[PDB]
């Protein structure tokens, strides 16, 4: 992979059960 | 966070 899949996985780890939004 | 090194702490600014 490129950058975004790894970034979105890191967001999922950091933001736990409070979720996140993501627009590239 | 892909050319420059980020920290999981710096990512908190994207949550809810």
């Amino acid at each position, epitope marked *: 992979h490129l950058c975004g899949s*790894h*970034l979105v996985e890191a967001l999922y780890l950091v933001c736990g059960e409070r979720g996140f939004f993501y627009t590239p | 966070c*892909c050319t*420059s090194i*980020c*920290s999981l*702490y710096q990512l908190e600014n994207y949550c809810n």
Partner: antibody
Amino acid sequence: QVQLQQSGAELVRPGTSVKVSCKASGYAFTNHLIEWVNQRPGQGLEWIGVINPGSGGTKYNEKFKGKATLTADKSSSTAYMQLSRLTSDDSAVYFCARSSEFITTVAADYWGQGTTLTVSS
Amino acid sequence: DIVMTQSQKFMSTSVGDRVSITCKASQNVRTAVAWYQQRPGQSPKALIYLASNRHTGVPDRFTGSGSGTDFTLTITNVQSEDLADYFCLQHWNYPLTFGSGTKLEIKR
């Protein structure tokens, strides 16, 4: 297999500069962050800095800013660490280690074998 | 800078007993903590990632737990090849910092 082979030991005089090599093999080299860590005789471990080898981005321990310079050669799949203004307090074993891609969600899952640096007049 | 405190610099045990090595963060580090093993004359080797996950190939007697500040590496049925140094580390924010280590020794 993940594998990091470091350059040989270094025995130099204070004030000089040194350049340590760390050759990666067994994975996609370009996007895995490479950390650098030192170990002084009998002590624990201190983090120096990290490099994104594909992008060339870096982040330094504030104590090592301007002492350590981290680089990457994507051609050879080699990471480099240069240490200037060497004093005897810098005598230590220096490790490179691999972490996850682009950003550190997993830190130092494979470690090189270490490079002994001795600084003496 | 975050300090990772391993309150016990030495820990004695007998082969087959249970040991529990603590590590307290100075501030909240979520689950971005790692555990390493270092045998004498060797490089460190990774054991636990993201607080509680075993790295591939590491025996199941090793177990990492914790969230927030109080982190723990529990070894059940300690074996002789487990006699070594154990370091925690936080990678929640830079610089990454290690605990100052716990040396696991045989009792007699």
